[PDB]
C-alpha cells in the first residue's frame, strides 16, 4: 500500500469531536499525517491503509463516515 490523501465526509458539529477523531487518528500505523475540517465536516488522512479500513477506523470514533475520493 502506498501513501495517498483520503478525503472523507463525517458526522460531527462541535470542536470536541473534531479533536476526538484527530486523536483516534494520531499515532496509527500507516498514517503519515491528517487535516480535519469541521467547517466542511471533512477529514483528510494521509495514509497507506485501504479506505475500507480507514472508514472502519473513523467509525471507531462514535459516528458515521463516507468517502468522497482521493486528493
Ligand atoms: Cu462535539
UniProtKB/Swiss-Prot annotation:
Signal peptide: none
Keywords: Chaperone, Copper, Cytoplasm, Disulfide bond, Isopeptide bond, Metal-binding, Phosphoprotein, Ubl conjugation, Zinc
Gene Ontology BP annotations: cellular response to oxidative stress; protein maturation; removal of superoxide radicals
Domain HMA residue range list: 3-66
Keyword tRNA processing included in the entry's annotation: no
Cross-link Glycyl lysine isopeptide (Lys-Gly) (interchain with G-Cter in ubiquitin) per UniProt, renumbered positions: 68
Compartment(s): Cytoplasm
Tissue specificity comment: Ubiquitous.
Main location: cytoplasm
Modifications the protein undergoes after translation, according to the UniProt entry: Ubiquitinion by XIAP/BIRC4 leads to enhancement of its chaperone activity toward its physiologic target, SOD1, rather than proteasomal degradation.
Keyword Ubl conjugation annotated: yes
Binding site for Cu cation 1: 14, 17
Gene Ontology MF: a single term: superoxide dismutase copper chaperone activity
One term under GO cellular component: mitochondrion
Stated family: In the C-terminal section; belongs to the Cu-Zn superoxide dismutase family.
Function in brief: Delivers copper to copper zinc superoxide dismutase (SOD1).
Subunit note: Homodimer, and heterodimer with SOD1. Interacts with COMMD1. Interacts with XIAP/BIRC4. Interacts with SLC31A1(via C-terminal domain); this interaction is Cu(1+)-mediated. The heterodimer CCS:SOD1 interacts with SLC31A1; this heterotrimer is Cu(1+)-mediated and its maintenance is regulated through SOD1 activation.
Protein name from the UniProt record: Copper chaperone for superoxide dismutase
Source organism: Homo sapiens
Phylogenetic placement of the source organism: Eukaryota, Metazoa, Chordata, Craniata, Vertebrata
Gene transcribed to yield this protein: CCS
Residues of the full protein shown: 9 to 79 of 274
